[PDB]
Amino acid sequence: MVVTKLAPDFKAPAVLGNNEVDEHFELSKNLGKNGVILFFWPKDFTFVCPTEIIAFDKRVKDFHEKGFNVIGVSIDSEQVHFAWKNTPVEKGGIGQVSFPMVADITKSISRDYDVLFEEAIALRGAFLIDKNMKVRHAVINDLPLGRNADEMLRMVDALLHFEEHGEVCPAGWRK
Amino acid sequence: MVVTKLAPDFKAPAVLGNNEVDEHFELSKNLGKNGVILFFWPKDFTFVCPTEIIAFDKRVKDFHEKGFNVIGVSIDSEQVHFAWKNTPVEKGGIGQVSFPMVADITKSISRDYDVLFEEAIALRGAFLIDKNMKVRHAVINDLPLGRNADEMLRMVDALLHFEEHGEVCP
Amino acid sequence: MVVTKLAPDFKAPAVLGNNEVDEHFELSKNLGKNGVILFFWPKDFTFVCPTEIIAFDKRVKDFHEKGFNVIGVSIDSEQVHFAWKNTPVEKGGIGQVSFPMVADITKSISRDYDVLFEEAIALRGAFLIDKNMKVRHAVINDLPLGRNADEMLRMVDALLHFEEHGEVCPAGWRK
Amino acid sequence: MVVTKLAPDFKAPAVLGNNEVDEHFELSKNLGKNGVILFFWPKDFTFVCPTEIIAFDKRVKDFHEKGFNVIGVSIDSEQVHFAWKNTPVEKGGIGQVSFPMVADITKSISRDYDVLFEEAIALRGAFLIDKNMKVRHAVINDLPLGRNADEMLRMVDALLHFEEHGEVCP
Amino acid sequence: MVVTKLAPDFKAPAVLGNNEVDEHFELSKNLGKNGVILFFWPKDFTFVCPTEIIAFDKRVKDFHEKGFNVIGVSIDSEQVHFAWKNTPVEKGGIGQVSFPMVADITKSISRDYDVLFEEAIALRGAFLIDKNMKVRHAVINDLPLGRNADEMLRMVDALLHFEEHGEVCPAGWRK
Amino acid sequence: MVVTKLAPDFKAPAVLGNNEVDEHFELSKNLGKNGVILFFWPKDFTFVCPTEIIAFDKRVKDFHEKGFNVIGVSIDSEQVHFAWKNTPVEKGGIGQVSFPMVADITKSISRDYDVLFEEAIALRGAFLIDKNMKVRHAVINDLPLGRNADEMLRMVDALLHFEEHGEVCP
Amino acid sequence: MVVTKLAPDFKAPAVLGNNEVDEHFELSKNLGKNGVILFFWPKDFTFVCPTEIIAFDKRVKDFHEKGFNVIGVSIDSEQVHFAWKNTPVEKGGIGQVSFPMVADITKSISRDYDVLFEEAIALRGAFLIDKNMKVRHAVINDLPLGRNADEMLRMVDALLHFEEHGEVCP
Amino acid sequence: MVVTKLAPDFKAPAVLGNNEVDEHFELSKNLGKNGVILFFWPKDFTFVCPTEIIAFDKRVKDFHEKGFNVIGVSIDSEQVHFAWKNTPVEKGGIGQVSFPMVADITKSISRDYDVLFEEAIALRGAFLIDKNMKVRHAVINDLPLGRNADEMLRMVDALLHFEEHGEVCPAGWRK
Amino acid sequence: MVVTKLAPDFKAPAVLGNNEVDEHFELSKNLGKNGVILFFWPKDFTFVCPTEIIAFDKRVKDFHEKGFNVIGVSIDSEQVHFAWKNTPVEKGGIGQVSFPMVADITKSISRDYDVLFEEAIALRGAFLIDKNMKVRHAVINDLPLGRNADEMLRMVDALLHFEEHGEVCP
Amino acid sequence: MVVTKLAPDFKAPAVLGNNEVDEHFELSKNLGKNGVILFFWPKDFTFVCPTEIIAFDKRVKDFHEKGFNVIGVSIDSEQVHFAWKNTPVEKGGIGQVSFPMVADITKSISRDYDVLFEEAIALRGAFLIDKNMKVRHAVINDLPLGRNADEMLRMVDALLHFEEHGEVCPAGWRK
């Protein structure tokens, strides 16, 4: 089980948004004011679509506004990460995205979150981690439809509302 | 992990939408045409909003249309699942619901799906199972904010929309 | 074996008589002056009869008068406990009983007293626990006839008599 | 636990009510028509009142009427069970009794029923066994106050009364 | 092996000669000036003969005169021991004997001396224990003929002679 | 324990009464008609009196009459058992004896009967074996005072006397 | 050790020289006529000179002439092997290469050949496998200085030169 | 794995170049300024050719000039080593070579470097060990063609070059 | 122990007296008519006197006459055994010898006979094996002083002399 | 293996030369100035010949002259040892020999030297033990021909010579 427990930390090398590589990127030292969204994806230079990487790069700003950071990780090295970032989008590239990409080269991180599939690559999953390094929400999927990048943003709202004016519902539930 | 693997099959007392009580409800049977949406909730007679149950009761029909059954499960007993349905919603009751409610009295199911929290109650989580008892998608959180019924539906659509029309990403 | 040994303690949430919930109800901190009667029962919102719960609620006062408290427990949560107490007796409810109802949600207590049946629910059993947390008498049954709620009261008498004018019997036993 | 499970079957020396001495008394045989009432007591020649034995001797007939045999057991040997029956009750004797007395010399029976106290003597406890060697009810305490014979009877009645006429609780 | 080794001690309840019961009778604290004869026997209220108990009771005095005490033990409780002592000899009783009778209720003593037969009763055996708690001689038998009660007495003599004027024999053994 | 159990059977070099040397003397063979009297002694060429051997040599005939063979055993080798018989009794010799002397060179026999003391020599002990290789009586001590031959005989008698005429104890 | 033993056979995705993507490339199949030269390199898209890849691409033909296939392997995925070939060499690309590139995504191959460094990437090492899946020669270092392609060739020659003409050492 | 790790040390007897035997020759105390080349070979007084020993003896000076020492080892005793050195080259001898020959009589060293073949003799392997006792390069072979003696010398150059003016290559690799 | 037990059979390279090199020399084969004399020595090319080898070379014929083959063994390889024979005895060589020299390269033989000292070399020891692969005599020391060849012969004689004419000790 | 290792010590009862028995004879405290010859033999009062005991008794003096003591041991008790010494030689006896005879009654010594045959008796073996309790030479045999008593004496010479003027041999071995 992952949800409710401490989000497993990691110190791996990651390619920042500005493309300069951080050798010892640490999950916990890179949280938003309200936490972060850690997400995985099978592999770089995929043949299908970066559905995941795409959706998320498009919300990075919406998330910042909500106090959350976006951190994506893949079992690919940081070199190949960088490469994908610099490969022209039409040429299959990913384009210079705005979030850190972590290199889980030894597949340890994926294992820790239990998304490591058949000892090779990470599933398409995302985790809502709060300011206390606790995983509150988690959605993992095994299909191309990278909906969770969006969905997560929707949960981040539901969470900040509920966190505020608490939870309300069917006016006739208790009277 | 749960996803990408065969959905752990179970067999337990359940309180069908029509308050009939099945004693040996097997997941591996009551599937939809394309699979099912198995979902959990902490406990019946909660003082917090049933959110999970509500959101799922509404969308039961759609999930159904698109060939997906909806099975709810809790660590509570059918006797109470039952009693919860037959209760004035202002009295905190749940009210007659469409989907079957499975009684995971031995908490074995919550464990197989790994949602058992502190050997006591299950986490608010939902699972998408295809026509081959394959867990293809799982969402799980620990707060009332019911959105599992929602997202699972959207996921059911998205999935199927893709079944045919691909998705030349933007 | 349970009888003769220390009554295993527990700290679980229980719905009091006045219906307000005690989060950390402790068996040992809730004893009568002469001890207590701890009793179990399969499940709430039963379809049959609360024979158990009934019989016992009707003696709660008789027991108080004897210096014993009544404490019933079930593998059901405290919410459902509360529910049953507030469900109209004719509607199947239990009515606002006068004794604490403990929620052995994790089935640990039932296990401790060895009444936990097939890893799911508690048998219909009752335990006479003295002022020293020792279980002196125990009667467990697996039928609807909740006779032991009564029976226990009878033992509590036999005990207080025996405890007083000691044990007497057939005038011609020793001469 | 003992209840809800098959009553551990045994086979040992016993001193039948008619002072005849059976060498291989098997519980699984000497049942009643509806089952039996197996009961233990600390030790023969006790200086405390035999209470258990007394109360059970009286009710032997009724338990019998209602189809229930009554088998007593102690960790003492048949030689002493015997000698205890043939003793002036003012001399602390027990007196010719109706039910058979089993000699649990190896304390194995007391163990199977889990009444062996300190690897020495058995606790004052009684067990209700139905026609299927099923322990359905058990009462066990640690004080002379004999009420096991009593309650077991009342239980035998109650049980049977219900066998037919239910019990629309009050 | 028992002989040559320390006689295993025990603290059990025993019915004395005068019939008052000693709760914590201790083998070592009850030795003669020259040691003691510890003997066992199957069970009380036997149907056959107390051959054992008889023979021994008749020598208790001869043994005392030799500086040895007689202590008999059986897997029967002290109640039944007492009983047998008070049951009229013709009625099968044992009669008010002159030696302590120990109650090896838990069969531990019999086990210690390795005379415990088939986890139930003690064999008919006797041990010559000296002033240093060492078993010098042991005779165990499995038949009704309680000859060892006698025999032991004969050994106690041979021992006190040999202990004195040492061992002598066939005048032509060494010259 | 040894008594009440099958006498551990052995097979080893033995020096028969007639100084003939059997190489594979099996206990289970050389029994008497009613059984045997197996007995041990510390060591040959002892400076202490052979007591055990003496007392047993005398009674060999009677033990024999009553259907009981007499087999002696020591941890010493047949070569020495032999040499001990052929020695001037004033020279500490034992002298031609009637019973066979078994050589328990590997001390395995002394162990099976549990008389091996300090992994070295055997204790002065004797065993009564009935026609069924059953140890029915055992006497064992640790001092010269030979009385085993004696008592075993008296025991052989007593036993047999009872075989017929009971013994209405006094 | 690896040498003198059967070359661990594998089966994984590979990007053939003609950018075709084989899913089940088995070493035990794609051998040469005399064997093969299996070789590893740390990682694709390296910022250090691909040395290994370069030197091997050149000599692919000769190794081929002499009956030796050339299979390269990395812990990277075919998707990236592919993408690495289709990249401007000034952009750090590798450029269309002649030999197949195997994707050791589970690092299992690097392990079997024992070149897996820190459970992460493979060491710059090459292996000579004869027509019998026998590792006959292995060179392995940990620095860019590509000379494996070189020496392996010279070794392929030398070896074969000897196949016939011996070598009366100087 | 051997490369990248610390070169296992050893203290065995070795026949020096000047033929006097060093009883406790220690790998680490016998390194060149830049390291050393440790090489093995099946056995002395071979029937085939000393290809290995030959090639290597011919570069000993070249390696010295590069700051490396040559140290060869074989599972043969140092007596036989000495013998071979003094056996006339045409008589099958090896001739008075200029490098230390180590006697791995117990086959431990060979085992350590994992060149020990079928519990009997060492494979034909060579190891490039740096000034920090780390094995940088390793080439092991199972054929007569002792090419690695040469090859190693070539690597030692590549290394000192690379170590200096670093690594260069295809002018159009990055621009 | 080695003696009184079957001589551990081996099979290894050996350099027969006639410098022919057998690859699979099995002890269990090359026996004499009455058995063999297997013997070890520390190491070839020793700077200490070969004593063992010398003394055994001389007596090879006699040992032979009396039906005893003579097999020498060392932890050195046949290549060196060979080279040692073909060496000027002033050059420390051994010189063409009559008996076969076994190469115990894996030290397994020295171990089976338990003469392996410090997992390195064998102790100067000799073993007498009869026509049934039975070790009947063993001499083993740790100093040059060659006398094994000697004593083994004398033992071979003595033994045989006794084969017939006994030996009424003095 | 025994040779080269420390000679296992022992403290057992031994019948001296003068026939008085030493209760705690200790191998190490009974060495000659140059060591000792420890020898075994199957059993006393043998039916065949004391070949062993004979040969050795005849050299006891020669050995003393060489600085070595002779100590023979047998799995027989010291009583029987004594007996054999006092039984007239023609009567099969051994005669009053001049060396200590040890009683390995528990077969431990035989075991320690690994001459204990089939858990019963000792093989005919002899060990040359030096002044440092190290077994330098060992000859064990399983036949009647007690040649080693002699042989040992021959080795003791070879040893004392070698120990002195060292080892010499074939004048043309090294030149």
**Residue in I with minimal Cα distance to J124:** I137
- Residue G134, exposed/middle/buried by CB under 10 A (0-12, 13-18, 19+)? middle
- Please identify which residue in the block is written with the tokens 């692969």: I133
CB contact at 8 A, J84 and J93: yes
**Dihedral, CA atoms, F150, F153, F159, F160, nearest 10 degrees?**
-150
Contacts of J17 (CB under 8 A, 6+ apart): J96, J97, J98, J99, J100
CA distance D76 to E81: 12
The per-residue DSSP string of F6-22 comes to BPPP-EEEEE-TTS-EE
The per-residue DSSP string of H157-173 comes to HHHHHHHSS-----TTS
If we measure between CA atoms, which residue out of I155, I37, I129, I62 comes closest to residue J145?
A: I155
CA distance B124 to C112: 29
Resolution (angstroms) stands at 3.0
Subunits with at least 3 CB pairs below 8 A relative to chain I? H, J
Beta strand pairing status for H121-122 and J35-40?
unpaired
- Please, after which residues is chain A broken with C–N above 2.5 Å? none
Amino acid at position D130, single letter: D
Amino acid at position I143, single letter: L
Q: Best mutation site among C114, C124, C137, C151 for testing chain D: the one with the most D CBs within 10 Å? A: C137
CA distance F90 to F86: 12
Contacts of B39 (CB under 8 A, 6+ apart): B52, B56, B70, B71, B72, B73, B125, B126, B127, B148, B149, B152
- In three-state form (DSSP H/G/I as H, E/B as E, the rest C), the secondary structure along chain J is CCCCCECCCCEEEEECCCCCEEEEEEHHHHCCCCEEEEEECCCCCCCCCCHHHHHHHHHHHHHHHCCEEEEEEECCCHHHHHHHHHCCHHHCCCCCCCCCEEECCCCHHHHHHCCEECCCEECEEEEEEECCCEEEEEEEECCCCCCHHHHHHHHHHHHHHHHCCCCCCCCCCCC
CA-CA distances (angstroms) from residue A142 to A52, E88, G15?
Answer: 12, 91, 25
**Dihedral, CA atoms, D43, D45, D49, D51, nearest 10 degrees?**
50
What is the token pair recorded at D129? 């066994």
CA distance D125 to C1: 12
Radius of gyration of chain C (CA): 16
Q: Report H helices in chain I.
A: 52-58, 60-65, 78-85, 108-112, 148-164
Number of residues that this document lists for chain H = 175
CA distance A75 to B81: 44
Tell me how crowded residue I141 is: count the other CB atoms within 10 A of its CB.
24
CA distance J119 to J110: 9
CB contact at 8 A, D137 and D165: no
Nearest to D142 among C4, C123, C144 (CB): C4
Q: Estimate to the nearest angstrom the gap between the alpha carbon of B30 and the chain centroid.
A: 12
Q: At what angle do helices A148-163 and B148-164 cross, to 10 degrees?
A: 170
CA distance H80 to H121: 15
In chain E, what residues touch D83 (CB-CB under 8 Å)?
45, 83-84, 87, 92
**Experimental technique behind these coordinates:** X-ray
Which H or E element spans position H149?
A: helix H148-163
If we measure between CA atoms, which residue out of J162, J159, J164 comes closest to residue J36?
A: J159
- Please identify which residue in the block is written with the tokens 């309300």: A168
What is the token pair recorded at J56? 């050795």
What is the token pair recorded at H40? 């093995």
- Active site (annotated) includes residue D49: yes
Contacts of A144 (CB under 8 A, 6+ apart): A48, A49, A51, B162, B167
Exposure letters D86-111 (e unless 16+ CB within 10 A, then b): ebeeeebbbbebebbbbbbbebbbbe
CA distance H14 to H12: 6
In chain A, what residues touch B169 (CB-CB under 8 Å)?
49-51, 54
CA distance B27 to B24: 10
CB contact at 8 A, E7 and E134: yes
CA distance E79 to E85: 10
CB contact at 8 A, H112 and H2: no
CA distance J49 to C93: 105
Are the beta carbons of I77 and H119 separated by less than 8 Å? no
Strand ranges, E, within E34-81: 35-40, 68-74
What is the token pair recorded at A63? 């998330």
In this structure, CATH architecture of domain I1-170: 3-Layer(aba) Sandwich (3.40)
CB contact at 8 A, G16 and G100: yes
Nearest to A172 among B50, B89, B169 (CB): B89
CA distance G153 to G165: 18
CA distance E41 to E51: 9
Q: What is the phi/psi pair of residue F152, to 5°?
A: -60, -35
CB contact at 8 A, E146 and E124: yes
SS3 I141: strand
Beta strand pairing status for H116-117 and I21-26?
unpaired
Tell me the helices (H) and strands (E) count for chain G, helix number first. Answer: 5, 9
What is the DSSP-derived secondary structure letter of residue A9?
P
**CA angle (J141, J144, J149) in 5-degree steps:** 65
What is the token pair recorded at J96? 């009053």
CB contact at 8 A, F1 and E115: yes
CB contact at 8 A, C151 and C55: no
Tell me how crowded residue J24 is: count the other CB atoms within 10 A of its CB.
10
**Residue in D with minimal Cα distance to E120:** D106
If we measure between CA atoms, which residue out of A7, A97, A82, A105 comes closest to residue A50?
A: A97
- Please identify which residue in the block is written with the tokens 């088995």: G26
CB contact at 8 A, C158 and C165: no
CB contact at 8 A, I105 and I99: no
What is the token pair recorded at J153? 């004496």
Subunits with at least 3 CB pairs below 8 A relative to chain J? F, I
The per-residue DSSP string of F48-77 comes to S--THHHHHHHTHHHHHHTTEEEEEEESS-
CA-CA distances (angstroms) from residue A92 to A40, A48, A60, A84, G165?
Answer: 19, 9, 21, 8, 53
What is the DSSP-derived secondary structure letter of residue D104?
-
CB contact at 8 A, C8 and C21: no
What is the DSSP-derived secondary structure letter of residue F86?
T
Are the beta carbons of J3 and I141 separated by less than 8 Å? yes
CA distance I85 to I124: 19
Question: Residue C36's beta-bridge partner residues?
Answer: C69, C129
If we measure between CA atoms, which residue out of I95, I121, I117, I76 comes closest to residue I19?
A: I95
Beta strand pairing status for D134-141 and C135-141?
antiparallel
Q: Report H helices in I48-168.
A: 52-58, 60-65, 78-85, 108-112, 148-164
Number of residues that this document lists for chain C = 175
State the catalytic residue, choosing from H3, H19, H45, H49: H49
Amino acid at position D42, single letter: P
CA distance E117 to E125: 11
The per-residue DSSP string of G62-101 comes to HHHHTTEEEEEEESS-HHHHHHHHTS-GGGT-----SS-E
User: What does the domain layout of chain H look like in residue ranges?
Assistant: 1-175
Q: What is the phi/psi pair of residue D44, to 5°?
A: -70, 170
G–I contact (≥3 CB pairs within 8 Å)? no
Torsion sign (Cα): I57, I58, I59, I65: positive
If we measure between CA atoms, which residue out of D20, D27, D25 comes closest to residue D98?
A: D20
CA distance A128 to A134: 8
Q: Estimate to the nearest angstrom the gap between the alpha carbon of H40 and the chain centroid.
A: 6
Exposure letters H136-161 (e unless 16+ CB within 10 A, then b): bbbbbbbbbbbbbbbbbbbbbebbee
Amino acid at position C99, single letter: F
**% helix / strand / coil in chain D, to the nearest 5?**
25, 30, 45
Q: What is the phi/psi pair of residue H13, to 5°?
A: -85, 135
SS3 I69: strand
Count CB pairs under 8 A between chains I and J.
112
SS3 E138: strand
Q: Which residue numbers of B have CB closer than 8 Å to C's CBs?
A: 43-47, 75-77, 79-80, 82-84, 87, 91-92, 105-106, 118-121
CA distance D142 to D139: 11
If we measure between CA atoms, which residue out of E116, E119, E139, E137 comes closest to residue E128?
A: E137
CA distance J45 to F105: 14
What is the DSSP-derived secondary structure letter of residue G53?
H
Q: Best mutation site among C79, C101, C121 for testing chain B: the one with the most B CBs within 10 Å? A: C79
SS3 I117: strand
Amino acid at position J64, single letter: H
State the catalytic residue, choosing from C49, C145, C158, C160: C49
CA distance J67 to J34: 5
What is the token pair recorded at E57? 């009771």
CA distance C13 to C23: 4
CATH of C1-175, one of 3.30.1300.10, 3.40.50.300, 3.40.30.10, 3.40.50.1580: 3.40.30.10
If we measure between CA atoms, which residue out of H38, H26, H21 comes closest to residue H83?
A: H21
Are the beta carbons of J3 and I142 separated by less than 8 Å? yes
CA distance G68 to C47: 80
State the catalytic residue, choosing from F6, F49, F145, F158: F49
Are the beta carbons of F79 and J43 separated by less than 8 Å? yes
**Dihedral, CA atoms, H146, H149, H151, H155, nearest 10 degrees?**
160
Count CB pairs under 8 A between chains F and J.
57
What is the DSSP-derived secondary structure letter of residue C20?
P
